[PDB]
Symmetry: C2
Subunit: 631 residues, 2 copies
């Protein structure tokens, strides 16, 4: 069974020989991607725990695995605890892991490319606070040579101790201006302006965030499954006396085509290889810098990997968001229009999927289908659509009790038969037009009063956030609250955020803005956000209703600008799940307004392609967009 006990007892033989007392493994890559590829998944190889979130502490004792609360169920069914100790990290338990390591040994090791500076600094500060009489020495270990080292040794490893897959040779391609509305040259010019005015204390900026590099250069790639990104670093050297000294692009050159180097060399970009980043920083750059108002040597993203961080002296590094974060959080008008087209396509795909579900429901063949079968079906209907690339994340297809698991990951052994019950579908896709994220909840059986109540309580928060009018200064955490409001009155909550930013053909989860309880800021026009309240009833069912929307200016008076949202997502809601004792007439009016707009948008497109859809499809569309009676 790819024996865990074996690979673990094997692991401590490699540690002992290098005189390493405690090893720390984390699920991460060097670019801090949410979804990491196979080469970077070490923890699963040892523990047979495939959950995305995890941190493994490996000592002479039984190893400890830390996972987020949302992954607790998955870890319980996967990990066997006679080998590993399972600990859970909750909202109040977060720094436990930092305490835990402190409470145990003289030499600790880290994967240099798999460890963020945030986790490193907090652990190290914990140890200063834990053992003040001990001094810490930090060394980078190159090519597995440990022979160069009272004291606590922090070892940052170039090569990982766990060695590991398929490789991507597919070529990079240009994202056309018609889709992104802004050329790579203007964006670089914008980054240039930022260095003149906004950040004056650094001449050197390193972009390690893959969606930032792709966005700035208008390039996409195949190095990741769910995002059209590519392994890269992009280094800017600014000369105050007022432009860029050097622009260096680290990436995989064999994946660089002819006419990409045309756009690249036009902007005066020097191309190096991907693995050249560390030696280039260590050898050419850091020695080239000269030694009241402080001036920093380098500006790094907050989550930059440990290996690149440790090349410098901490006093000279500035950890902050790249200017690209703000740049890309606000879409231009071409970008919004393109995001509308993508959602039109995605509405058609959902229409085909639920039409398909409805037919098989009537024929009852639907209940021989599985979660994976339905997951594959919606992904298929998207692939038929124009300018589609691939799904924007792993589709969540959950029937009955599985819908109560937010992070539910359908395995080959977890796959469930579709039942006449609640069905939750969270899915999206990557288009040249943009990135989509949408959730709909439906019912293939006869909905209970509880199910309709929960759905409607969730819907009310969702509908509120759709049309909410708020002064421009309003903190986005206030918008998170009104989505929870109706659940709060019933003493119910959901354990995730209400909305996340979404990139344009980049990442389905994008920073720069959000709607959530912890942290928040005013929203700006043409920010693109999800709206997805939910509620999850353990062992019974779960509900989530998700749209994407963008911020508009609603009205401007003498003293104040009022903002609101406009819809991106076009698909109707589930009438079978509606509780009308909870619904106001205004909400019903907004429901009818939305559904009518959907019919007006989708129906002509359905009709012009009778071979692709047909009368049964358009008839289904008409019925679910039909106005609800007010009386």
């Amino acid at each position: 069974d790819n024996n865990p006990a074996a690979r673990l007892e094997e692991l401590r033989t490699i540690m002992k020989k290098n005189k390493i007392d405690v090893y720390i493994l984390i699920n991460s890559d060097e670019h801090n991607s949410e979804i990491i590829n196979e080469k970077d998944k070490k923890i699963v190889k040892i523990t047979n725990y495939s959950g995305a979130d995890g941190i493994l502490i490996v000592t002479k004792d039984k190893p400890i695995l830390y996972v987020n609360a949302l992954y607790e169920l998955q870890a319980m069914n996967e990990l066997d605890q006679n080998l590993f100790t399972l600990r859970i990290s909750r909202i109040d338990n977060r720094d436990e892991i930092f305490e835990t390591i402190s409470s145990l040994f003289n030499t600790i090791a880290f994967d240099g490319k798999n460890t963020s500076v945030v986790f490193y600094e907090k652990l190290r500060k914990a140890l200063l606070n834990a053992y003040p009489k001990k001094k810490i020495v930090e060394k980078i270990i190159y090519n597995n040579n440990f022979d160069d080292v009272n004291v606590l040794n922090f070892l940052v490893l170039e090569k990982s101790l766990v060695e590991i897959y398929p490789v991507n040779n597919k070529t990079l391609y240009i994202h056309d201006r018609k889709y992104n509305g802004a050329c790579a040259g203007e964006k670089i010019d914008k980054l240039k302006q930022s260095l003149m005015y906004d950040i004056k204390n650094v001449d050197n900026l390193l972009l390690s965030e893959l969606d930032e590099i792709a966005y700035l250069l208008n390039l996409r790639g195949y190095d990741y499954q769910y995002s059209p990104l590519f392994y890269s670093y992009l280094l800017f050297q600014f000369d105050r006396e007022q432009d860029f000294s050097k622009i260096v692009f680290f990436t995989t050159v064999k994946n660089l085509p002819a006419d990409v180097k045309n756009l690249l060399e036009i902007n005066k970009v020097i191309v190096k290889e991907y693995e050249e980043i560390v030696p280039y920083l260590r050898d050419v750059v850091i020695p080239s810098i000269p030694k009241d108002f402080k001036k920093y040597d380098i500006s790094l993203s907050p989550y930059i990997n440990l290996m690149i961080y440790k090349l410098f002296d901490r006093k000279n590094v500035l950890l902050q968001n790249s200017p690209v974060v703000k740049m890309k959080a606000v879409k231009n008008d071409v970008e919004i229009d393109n995001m509308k087209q993508a959602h039109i396509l995605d509405g058609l795909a959902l229409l085909q999927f639920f039409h398909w579900c409805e037919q098989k429901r009537k024929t009852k063949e639907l209940f021989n289908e599985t979660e994976m079968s339905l997951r594959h079906k919606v992904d298929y209907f998207r692939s038929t659509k124009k300018n589609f690339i691939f799904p924007s994340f792993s589709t969540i297809s959950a029937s009955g009790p599985n819908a109560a698991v937010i992070h539910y990951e359908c395995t080959d052994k977890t796959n469930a038969t579709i039942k006449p019950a609640i069905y939750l579908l969270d899915s999206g896709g990557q288009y040249l037009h943009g990135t989509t994220d949408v959730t709909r909840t439906t019912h293939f059986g006869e909905p209970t009063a509880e199910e309709k109540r929960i759905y409607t309580l969730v819907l009310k928060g969702h509908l509120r956030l759709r049309k909410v009018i708020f002064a421009s200064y309003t903190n986005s955490s206030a918008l998170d609250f009104i989505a929870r409001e109706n659940l709060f009155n019933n003493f119910m909550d959901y354990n995730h955020g209400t909305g996340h930013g979404v990139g344009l053909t980049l990442n389905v989860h994008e920073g720069g803005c959000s709607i959530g309880p912890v942290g928040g800021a005013p929203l700006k026009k043409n920010m693109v956000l999800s709206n997805e309240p939910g509620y999850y009833m353990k062992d019974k069912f779960g509900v989530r209703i998700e749209n994407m929307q963008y911020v508009i200016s609603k009205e401007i008076t003498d003293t104040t600008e009022y903002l609101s949202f406009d819809d991106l997502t076009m698909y109707p809601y589930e009438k079978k799940l509606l509780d009308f004792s909870l619904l106001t007439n205004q909400e019903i009016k907004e429901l009818n307004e939305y559904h009518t707009t959907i019919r007006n948008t989708l129906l002509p497109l359905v009709k012009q392609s009778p071979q692709e859809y047909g009368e049964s499809v358009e008839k289904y569309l008409i019925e679910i967009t039909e106005p609800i009676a007010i009386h």
Copy 2:
């Protein structure tokens, strides 16, 4: 009191000394400052509380908060001084707006304004040298002045007194012990703490004083010296002639050494400072501490942060809450007497011979009748008609208006041994227009929502500010102030540690005491504000979550004449009746037990305004 004369006279004293910056503030950063600290008004004849005066060779520039703009416009002469306004988005304009040797009042300037100004001017003029000027000797050379360039006026000899445990529920020793633990665990990088906030010192020592009009505070400093594991020395700087016999008993009981007030700077420079990657700080100072004390230390060694006392007093213990309920019971009775009085004169038309100030005096009187009353907690706002549209409206001798059959707004409160009250009610002495009724009800809807709102404990207080605005937002209307502020116990009516507002925000904790006061102000016509005080309670605890809500402190009804029933939900009607009935159940037995202070006419009036709405 010629401004031009005093301005050109001001220019005789600076020129000999080779931009002067005047601010309305005192050394303890109090909202309300005494006569000794108002310099700007002497030059500009601008009596507004908030202001900063930039004095250069050109025409001087005065910066005031937006709420003081109306007052500043008719008072200030604008051909002499340039008037600029500070709103929510122009906050740093003045620093941009802000030359060679520049001067500041050392005791009237906070380090926040000082450091932000210096960092900004550096940000492009890449070098600055800073010197302290003692006793007006400038010949040794940013200039920080010990003595101001701009003081005959009165002094308080009234005695300090002890705040009994029965009111505050915790002894001074217990609070110090809490402050002690804080230094053990929470703050390990500094051994020295200086309390410059008068309400923090008053709270900790359970002492009150007469040095301020609207708050029972006293000029003081309190310095703590921590030794790795207790306080080595605790020194209390204050005015000893105002220190009575048995207060110095409570002081020496806590092993506090009493020095005088003016010894603060000499004791710091001479006695303490000559002592003492992972950094250790010499001193911890409150963010708004004056420059004079700040410049005794090097910036690198100065840790600027909220004292632990801020968190301590922002959360009331149960005795403190119970006392504050008693305070509001008394203040409900006072309001009852006042509006009953207004109603009587309304029927006879005698009300419209009354003025705003006369009504202001009347409500303050009815408070003075109540047990354990000390004085008003702030200047009572009494505004009729168009004046109600002014948020900051200060009734003057020349602004005093005859009471009219129109909107009337009353914002008032008092200091009790039991606590500090703040309450606003808006009523109508005429026949309310549909517009007036609509605006009142839109404000009320936000107010009522904030009363009973259920929120998970992590909810940012800015979310609560929003739901108070939302019904106004839908009509594209807003109010230019915050929704709520913290309130001290027999302390400042505006207290930090928490708030409900659009900009800053944090989760709320149980037994925090906050105002709830949405409003709307229609220029030149009328204005409405509805204010309660309430405290945070635990509503429900589930497996995964704690839900919080508020419980009422303020007991007084709302105005039925101003209700727009097209805007009111049945839930809102139900809550109104629940509140009004509760008020009757609370107040009526007390009204009945004192017929000579509260007549039969009063009991009937109370019953009428607490009567259920037909829904």
